[PDB]
Amino acid sequence: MKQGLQLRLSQQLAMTPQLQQAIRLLQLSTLELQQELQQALESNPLLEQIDTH
Amino acid sequence: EYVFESPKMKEILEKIKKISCAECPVLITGESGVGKEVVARLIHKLSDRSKEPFVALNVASIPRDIFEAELFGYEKGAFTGAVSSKEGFFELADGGTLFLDEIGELSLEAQAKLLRVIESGKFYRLGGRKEIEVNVRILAATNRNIKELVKEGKFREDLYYRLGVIEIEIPPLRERKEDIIPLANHFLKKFSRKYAKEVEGFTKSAQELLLSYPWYGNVRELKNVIERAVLFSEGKFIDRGELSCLV
Amino acid sequence: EYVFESPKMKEILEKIKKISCAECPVLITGESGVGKEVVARLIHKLSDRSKEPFVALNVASIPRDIFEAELFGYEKGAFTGAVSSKEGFFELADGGTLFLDEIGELSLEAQAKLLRVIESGKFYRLGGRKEIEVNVRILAATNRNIKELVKEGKFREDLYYRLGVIEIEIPPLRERKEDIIPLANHFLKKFSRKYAKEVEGFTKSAQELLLSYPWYGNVRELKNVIERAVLFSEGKFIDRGELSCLV
Amino acid sequence: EYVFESPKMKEILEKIKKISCAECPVLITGESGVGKEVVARLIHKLSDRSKEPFVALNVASIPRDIFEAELFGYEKGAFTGAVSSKEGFFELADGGTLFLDEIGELSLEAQAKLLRVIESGKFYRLGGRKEIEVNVRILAATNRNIKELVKEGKFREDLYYRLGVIEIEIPPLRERKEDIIPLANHFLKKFSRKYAKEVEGFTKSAQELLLSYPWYGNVRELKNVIERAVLFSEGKFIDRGELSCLV
Amino acid sequence: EYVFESPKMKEILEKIKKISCAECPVLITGESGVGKEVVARLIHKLSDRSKEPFVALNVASIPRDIFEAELFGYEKGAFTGAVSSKEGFFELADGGTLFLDEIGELSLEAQAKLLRVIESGKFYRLGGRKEIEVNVRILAATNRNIKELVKEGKFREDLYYRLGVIEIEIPPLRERKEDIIPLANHFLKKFSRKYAKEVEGFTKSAQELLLSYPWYGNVRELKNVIERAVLFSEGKFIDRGELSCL
Amino acid sequence: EYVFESPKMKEILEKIKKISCAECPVLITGESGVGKEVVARLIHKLSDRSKEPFVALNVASIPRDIFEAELFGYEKGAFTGAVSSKEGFFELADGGTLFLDEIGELSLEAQAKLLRVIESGKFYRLGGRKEIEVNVRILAATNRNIKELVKEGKFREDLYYRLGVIEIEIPPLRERKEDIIPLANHFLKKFSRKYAKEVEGFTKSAQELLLSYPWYGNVRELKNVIERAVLFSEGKFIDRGELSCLV
Amino acid sequence: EYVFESPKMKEILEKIKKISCAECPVLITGESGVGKEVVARLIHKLSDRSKEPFVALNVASIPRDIFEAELFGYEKGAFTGAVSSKEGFFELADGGTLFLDEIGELSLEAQAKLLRVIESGKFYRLGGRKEIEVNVRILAATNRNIKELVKEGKFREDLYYRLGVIEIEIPPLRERKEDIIPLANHFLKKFSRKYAKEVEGFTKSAQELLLSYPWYGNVRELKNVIERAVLFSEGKFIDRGELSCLV
Amino acid sequence: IRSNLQDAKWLIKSLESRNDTLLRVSRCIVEQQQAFFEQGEEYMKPMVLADIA
Ligand SMILES: Nc1ncnc2c1ncn2[C@@H]1O[C@H](COP(=O)(O)OP(=O)(O)OP(=O)(O)O)[C@@H](O)[C@H]1O
Ligand SMILES: Nc1ncnc2c1ncn2[C@@H]1O[C@H](COP(=O)(O)OP(=O)(O)OP(=O)(O)O)[C@@H](O)[C@H]1O
Ligand SMILES: Nc1ncnc2c1ncn2[C@@H]1O[C@H](COP(=O)(O)OP(=O)(O)OP(=O)(O)O)[C@@H](O)[C@H]1O
Ligand SMILES: Nc1ncnc2c1ncn2[C@@H]1O[C@H](COP(=O)(O)OP(=O)(O)OP(=O)(O)O)[C@@H](O)[C@H]1O
Ligand SMILES: Nc1ncnc2c1ncn2[C@@H]1O[C@H](COP(=O)(O)OP(=O)(O)OP(=O)(O)O)[C@@H](O)[C@H]1O
Ligand SMILES: Nc1ncnc2c1ncn2[C@@H]1O[C@H](COP(=O)(O)OP(=O)(O)OP(=O)(O)O)[C@@H](O)[C@H]1O
Ligand SMILES: [Mg+2]
Ligand SMILES: [Mg+2]
């Protein structure tokens, strides 16, 4: 009956997707996966990788 | 108990007896308080499906954004917050009767969605995949002039002609004057016992005004007037003086 | 606690006492500030259900999009955000009285949702599949000529006859000339106790001016005038010069 | 801190001191820039609620589709997107005063949502089944003439008598000739201190010019003129030539 | 980089310099193409908020029903679809300058919504209960006559005195006849450099023709004319023939 | 391929060649069917953005209420029902050309929204706090005298000088009689190939009739006439009889 | 099935069969009841799209506020209410023929919204950022002389030149003096077959009345009158009395 | 510290899931093509992603 942009309180049935997260890790090869892991290690102080030094 | 003491109403009752066996949708028509609910319940009672559930519904009380979800049901995960799978009204009343009061308030989208199931006879749940058969006897009622609605465009022509297989129109009470007197006494005995009043009948002068007043509310207005007269009057008989203010 | 010295108010009180046993809906009409809510609460108090809830609603403050959820309740999972089941105002007032204030400000589309609950008392929740039956007495109050609204087409005719089973109209204070002097004194005393003043009564000229002035706000405006007179009073008696400048 | 020198502006102060113990709603009227908010905050400060919140609310910036949610609040699950219970401005201002600024801009449909809360003080939250009672004093300010609007029809009659218990009208600055010079000197001192200038006072010609100008913006316009004069000044005395904008 | 040679346009520059220590709102008026945006940005540049954000907002481009949401912001759960809190433009321009361009095209309903934020700087977000205080300097520009509109009744009186603490009116180009030739040379040099042409001046006839045309679009129309002349130029001097568009 | 034979058309073509190195907005004016879109697409093809998008937009088919959301876009929570971010048309045509077709039908309220974007190229989305900068070249077409509209007051003066940096006016076909016969032959060959007819040319009398007719639909009307003549032809040549539509 | 007997009807049939290979938009002009829709359906049947949908739309009956949404459709999240995507009429009739009934009653503003789609065939759905391309044959019907309407300024000239490639006119029954008897006989025998009536043919007396009686509703009213007469028929042959009863 | 710890846990779980999925898919592929590893080519079986899925 009308086409407008409004702010209102309604009761609606809502759908939403739930897939995309952590799926990018499957396609990556081992070398790119290690590079991404290094990038994650740099930003997160609580992540460490096993070393022999 | 109901009152059917007019030839125009007696032939309607005979048509009810000749229609109650059928399994096609019925559409009732009339003014306010003519007896559409009575007609629908008599149709359901006189049919073989009397023991089957009778679900009466008010289509104007169903929110738009969930309309179909209320009428066809939904499965698990159909929308966010769907914690279970609930059946619709077409599945609640299976083998019985579905009454849709005031069928004139549906939006065009609602009319199309209802007509789809009425024609095809099968529907899918909101989040489901399997199909469900109807096995539902559909009755509808309204007081609006459906011809004017379809001519204007507020009501779909296909839906009306699909529901128009059987049509029953109760005449207004102003055309059923011979039925006015039997109705009033029927109310008079009901309320007098209900309120412990000793009123037992009308006076001759009082009955004259009953047949002379145009009843805009039809039976409901007459019942209201009789209830007021019984509640307020405290004499053996109801006189025209008491009804003068009410009428 | 209230003054009903006028003959018309005495007759209204007699009618209120006459319908104590009944449970039919009541429609109250009048001007602004005449005492419609006083009459409604007196009707509730004199009835047999006087110990039951008296749920008063302002139908103009219920949002259009959630009218059905705030009046019939809903089941959990009926819509996104319906985390738990809730009741409605009809179940909250079950066994008691429901008062609808300023019912003339109700939109035409929202008046079609009250057609079946008022008459029969049976309804379904949102997402519920079992019928709920309640016993609620219904009182409605409006300050507009409801019959004129029906004639002009802004009020549904099928709802007026469901509501107006018993109609009570309260005359304005301009015609209740006997109640002006008492209602003043009463209010005076009340305010003379609230602010701890030494006022004891009106002079004869002040009473004459009170009787002469045509009140447009009725008892509410009388309250306001008396409160202003008491607040700024300095003396044992209220003179004409104070309330004259007030009016 | 404020200047009250004219005889008409001293009876207002006496009235403010007289209504210290009251709790009735106050309505303030007057032209633009006369000091309505100054009077409102002075009324709040000289009462027993002086240590309580003063919630100043512009009723013209509340969207009409969420109005009921702003004043009354809601509960979790009231609608889609409501994930936590939230309070309203009537519950935020409990124990203090609520100041409705520019009450004359409220639409007719938005004035009907307040009728039951101005007087009684009880309401229900959106989706709440428990009644909430608050103790709030209501001040309202407008620059219109509500008595004219009510007769015209743009303002509800039943709300004017609820809000208008004590009415205060502030005269325009052109009728407050004894306030012009003290206000001018006060503004000059304030702005000379703020801008670190070396201005001290006015010249006799400038003072004569100020007393003749028919101020339309009243005190706000006088304040703007003094600020302009201070910003562009070089000497110690402001001359008639500097106040060339008045001519 | 801007040209200010007319006697009227240098008093305005001096007045702009003299108000560098103030924080009062400014109202700029004139015709179209006179340079209100230039004056507003120069006011911002020559003040103490030089490094602070300059938010230029076209108040006629905001939808009617989301005006408050845009200007003030909202909290989570304010309405159906408010999934997270979001700031407004008064919080975005906090500590800086807000330039409400073309304030004359604002409806009376929308003028009453920003009546308390201009003088106080305090407001409530949609669905928010705490009061927010900001420090923003307001500049407004319009080609109408706000005083005449207020007298008519289509502009609110209570907003004009909140905005018009300092008022600057820019004269039309047809009266700043000392600026026409410097502006023409400036635009000619700019466009000749940009399009890589060889034009470097006007003839005497062209100069006499530029000093009599009643510029209706003012400096913008002059810029358009110079751009057309440069694009279609052939030689090294623009004759009167290339200016036949006047 | 297109036909340009008249000296005015060749002059317009030379102007298009000259302005190929610029990025100024262009405004095209003429009658109905003169070839404004042909000129716009030729300008796009001969420019430096030949491989970039050419977004042709009819500004009269955009609803008034959602005009801003179509051209600027919106963020996730701009309004009720907004679920995801979406770009506008000024961001879809970044690096290319935007062709506003029939700009003369835009109302003044809608014209006011296009002021800053045309010159600056920067804007904010609906609900976005970051400024988006784009590089789009504006072509606009209309068949109404924009100068006359501006003088009358039906077109904003602030937009004409932003759009009308370069102005092209296409003469009517009535003034291009050197361009009629080639267009007729072109359309005749095109439609003969399409419909597989056997016509090959016009008689001398037919050529005289075609050249003497004052075309009001210009090239579109000529194309329609030629198509009808080809469809209804039966002979090898289209004589004067087949052109009976012309008067 | 349809009956074409008049020489003008045969000429129209020949024209339709000749332009069967074309795809150009067709315009039809004539009075109501002459059978414009029948002609359009016959054109569709004989064309190359005989196995494709025939979508018929009454543009004058579409509400203004949603006029775009019906034609172009919309994308999800375009506005408050676009919960799911939709497709317009131009996309439903992809590959078929779209018929525009009562095109002459279209508002002057609405016509400008159909300028490009009729010619180019490309459009954007409301909220969509990709261009939709369709192939639809446009048939239009009007009840008024479109050229005179354009000369009155009530119709867009551009739309008239876009639609009017091939134009057809249908004379009313007052000029079709020969088809009346065959049409009446066909209708009578069809209704006899439908209702299994005893009727076998009209008498000589009744035939003259049809030619005597002028026709304003044309074929529609003739069919309605003949059907009503069939419902009133009780014998094998019908005299003039039954036909003369209606008029 | 708590936010970074939960992010680290999520990343470690994602890596473990990726490795498990890779092992399962590879083992299924090897099981399907069992005659190839005993006799080389000419004994390949025709399979697509649907079979492994
Ligand atoms: N034949 C009848 N005999 C006795 N009472 C009757 C009869 N018909 C109807 N009534 C009375 O009608 C009243 C209710 O009216 P009803 O439900 O039939 O109205 P309605 O036509 O459906 O109204 P609306 O269309 O306005 O909703 C009952 O109290 C019932 O007693
Ligand atoms: N008989 C009475 N004795 C004392 N006070 C009375 C009497 N009648 C009315 N009042 C007073 O009149 C005032 C007006 O309020 P009331 O709610 O009665 O008015 P109303 O406009 O009819 O109501 P509403 O619009 O809220 O339904 C009340 O404060 C009440 O105390
Ligand atoms: N007596 C006074 N002494 C000093 N300043 C005053 C006085 N009266 C008014 N003012 C000044 O006048 C200015 C405007 O006053 P105010 O905000 O009350 O105006 P208003 O238009 O009536 O209010 P509002 O629109 O906010 O309800 C203020 O800056 C205030 O300082
Ligand atoms: N003194 C000047 N020196 C150089 N360029 C100038 C001068 N005055 C104006 N201009 C130029 O004139 C053009 C138009 O100016 P501007 O945008 O300020 O006009 P306006 O119509 O007042 O503004 P708006 O409508 O955007 O609020 C700009 O390109 C600007 O650079
Ligand atoms: N020089 C030309 N050579 C070939 N075809 C041409 C030429 N000029 C115009 N046309 C044709 O004329 C037809 C109509 O022209 P066009 O689409 O440009 O109209 P317009 O100027 O946009 O009209 P309106 O203002 O009615 O929208 C097109 O199909 C186009 O191909
Ligand atoms: N030549 C004909 N032969 C047979 N039936 C015809 C003929 N002309 C018209 N009719 C009948 O006329 C009836 C009504 O006319 P129709 O609706 O087709 O035309 P119209 O009045 O031009 O169109 P519209 O009603 O859509 O505006 C149709 O059902 C059709 O069967
Ligand atoms: Mg009913
Ligand atoms: Mg075009």
F38 is in an annotated binding site: yes
What are the tokens at B33? 């308080």
CA distance C62 to C65: 9
C166 with C190, same domain: the answer is no
From B173, B196, B231, the end of a domain falls on B173
Task: Tell me how many degrees the CA angle F70-F75-F79 measures, rounded to the nearest 5.
Answer: 80
CA distance F2 to G135: 24
Specify the ligand 4 atom closest to the Cα of E28. 22
Residues of F within 8 A of E69 (CB-CB) are: 78-79, 127
How distant, in Å, are the alpha carbons of C233, D25, D167, E140 from that of C188?
11, 19, 20, 56
Residue F27 bridge partners (DSSP): F140, F167
Contacts of G88 (CB under 8 A, 6+ apart): G69, G70, G71, G72, G73, G125
What are the tokens at E191? 């466009």
Say if residues D3 and D35 touch (Cβ distance below 8 Å).
no
Burial class (CB in 10 A: 0-12, 13-18, 19+), F157: middle
Contacts of F212 (CB under 8 A, 6+ apart): none
Measured between CA atoms, how close is G168 to chain F, in angstroms?
A: 13
Whether F33 is in the pocket of ligand 5, judged by its Cβ within 6 Å, is yes
Q: Obtained via which technique? A: cryo-EM
**Chains F and E are in contact, defined as 3 or more C-beta pairs closer than 8 angstroms:** yes
- Phi-psi label, residue C122: left if phi above 0, alpha if psi -120 to 50, beta otherwise: beta
CA-nearest of A3, F84, F78 to G129 is F84
Say if residues E28 and E140 touch (Cβ distance below 8 Å).
yes
Owner of token pair 């005993």:
H38
E151 with E201, same domain: the answer is no
Could you give the maximum distance between any two Cα atoms of chain A, in Å?
72
Specify the ligand 3 atom closest to the Cα of E115. 25
Chain A residues with a Cβ under 8 Å from any Cβ in chain E: 4-10, 12
F17 with F113, same domain: the answer is yes
What is the tally of structural domains in chain G? 2
CA-nearest of C225, C217, C183, C184 to C201 is C184
The CATH number covering residue E37 comes to 3.40.50.300
From D173, D193, D215, the end of a domain falls on D173
Resolution number, Å: 2.7
CA distance F9 to H15: 69
The CATH number covering residue C245 comes to 1.10.8.60
- The residue of chain A nearest to residue C79, with distances taken between CA atoms, is A13
Closest residue to F87, CB basis, from G68, G80, G129: G129
E121 with E53, same domain: the answer is yes
Taking the centre of ligand 3 as the mean of its atom positions, its distance from the CA of residue D54, in whole angstroms, is 17
Taking the centre of ligand 1 as the mean of its atom positions, its distance from the CA of residue F20, in whole angstroms, is 81
Whether F16 is in the pocket of ligand 5, judged by its Cβ within 6 Å, is no
CA-nearest of G145, G79, G80, G70 to G110 is G70
Task: Tell me how many degrees the CA angle A18-A24-A30 measures, rounded to the nearest 5.
Answer: 150
B126 with B55, same domain: the answer is yes
DSSP 8-state class, residue E232? T
Closest residue to E80, CB basis, from A4, A5, A10: A10
C36 with C119, same domain: the answer is yes
Residues of C within 8 A of D165 (CB-CB) are: 224, 227-228
D192 touches chain E (CB under 8 A): no
H or E segment and range at residue F57: strand F54-58
Whether C2 is in the pocket of ligand 2, judged by its Cβ within 6 Å, is yes
CA-nearest of B212, B238, B216 to B143 is B216
Residue G139 bridge partners (DSSP): G26, G99
- In one-letter notation, the amino acid at residue D211 is L
H7 touches chain A (CB under 8 A): yes
Residues of E within 8 A of D32 (CB-CB) are: 157-158, 161
Say if residues C119 and C158 touch (Cβ distance below 8 Å).
no
From F153, F173, F193, the end of a domain falls on F173
Task: Tell me how many degrees the CA angle G33-G39-G43 measures, rounded to the nearest 5.
Answer: 165
Measured between CA atoms, how close is A6 to chain G, in angstroms?
A: 7
CA distance B119 to B156: 14
Residue nearest to atom 19 of ligand 6 (CA): G35
Residues of D within 8 A of E158 (CB-CB) are: 32-33, 143
CA distance F196 to F181: 22
Which ligand does the CA of G143 lie closest to? 6
Say if residues B108 and B125 touch (Cβ distance below 8 Å).
no
Task: Tell me how many degrees the CA angle C100-C102-C105 measures, rounded to the nearest 5.
Answer: 115
Contacts of A16 (CB under 8 A, 6+ apart): B80
B198 is in an annotated binding site: no
Neighbours of chain H (3+ CB pairs under 8 A): A
CA distance F218 to F31: 8
E243 with E145, same domain: the answer is no
Taking the centre of ligand 4 as the mean of its atom positions, its distance from the CA of residue E2, in whole angstroms, is 10
CA distance A46 to C224: 70
Taking the centre of ligand 3 as the mean of its atom positions, its distance from the CA of residue E138, in whole angstroms, is 20
CA distance B182 to B180: 6
CA distance C2 to C183: 8
**From the CB of residue F43, how many other CB atoms can be counted at a distance below 10 Å?**
21
Taking the centre of ligand 5 as the mean of its atom positions, its distance from the CA of residue D98, in whole angstroms, is 66
**From the CB of residue A37, how many other CB atoms can be counted at a distance below 10 Å?**
15
CA distance G114 to G119: 9
Residue nearest to atom 8 of ligand 3 (CA): D35
B240 is in an annotated binding site: no
B66 touches chain A (CB under 8 A): yes
| DSSP string computed for chain B | -----SHHHHHHHHHHHHHTT--S-EEEE-STTSSHHHHHHHHHHHSGGGGS-EEEEEGGGS-GGGHHHHHHEE-TTSSTT--S-EE-HHHHSSSSEEEEE-GGG--HHHHHHHHHHHHH-EEE-SS--SEEE---EEEEEESS-HHHHHHHTSS-HHHHHHHTTEEEEPPPGGG-GGGHHHHHHHHHHHHHHHTT----EE-HHHHHHHTTS--SSTHHHHHHHHHHHHHH--SSEE-HHHHHHH-
Domain that holds residue C208: 174-247
C73 with C99, same domain: the answer is yes
Residues of H within 8 A of A42 (CB-CB) are: none
C138 with C185, same domain: the answer is no
Burial class (CB in 10 A: 0-12, 13-18, 19+), G190: middle
Quick check: A6 and G80 CB within 8 A? yes
Contacts of F180 (CB under 8 A, 6+ apart): F173, F210, F211, F222
Residue C86 bridge partners (DSSP): C74
Secondary structure of B1-44 in HEC code, one letter for each residue? CCCCCCHHHHHHHHHHHHHCCCCCCEEEECCCCCCHHHHHHHHH
Question: Which C-chain residues 65-104 have CB contacts (< 8 A) with chain B?
Answer: 68-69, 72, 76-83
Secondary structure of chain C in HEC code, one letter for each residue? CCCCCCHHHHHHHHHHHHCCCCCCCEEEEECCCCCHHHHHHHHHHHCCCCCCCEEEEECCCCCHHHCCHHHHCECCCCCCCCCCCECCHHHHCCCCEEEEECHHHCCCCCHHHHHHHHHCCEECCECCCCCEECCCEEEEEECCCHHHHHHHCCCCHHHHHHHCCEEEEECCCCCCHHHHHHHHHHHHHHHHHHCCCCCCEECHHHHHHHHHCCCCCHHHHHHHHHHHHHHCCCCCEECHHHHHHHC
Question: What is the C-alpha end-to-end distance of chain H, expressed in Å?
Answer: 40
Measured between CA atoms, how close is A7 to chain C, in angstroms?
A: 12
Residues of A within 8 A of E63 (CB-CB) are: 5
G17 with G135, same domain: the answer is yes
How distant, in Å, are the alpha carbons of F29, F35, F100, G24, G120 from that of F141?
6, 10, 6, 26, 16
C73 with C183, same domain: the answer is no
Whether F71 is in the pocket of ligand 5, judged by its Cβ within 6 Å, is no
Quick check: F32 and G113 CB within 8 A? no
Taken in order C93, C98, C103, C108, is the CA torsion positive or negative? positive
F150 with F224, same domain: the answer is no
Owner of token pair 């309401």:
D123
Specify the ligand 4 atom closest to the Cα of E2. 3
CA-nearest of F93, F52, F45, F50 to F70 is F93
G228 touches chain F (CB under 8 A): no
Which ligand does the CA of E35 lie closest to? 4
D52 is in an annotated binding site: no
Say if residues C140 and C26 touch (Cβ distance below 8 Å).
yes
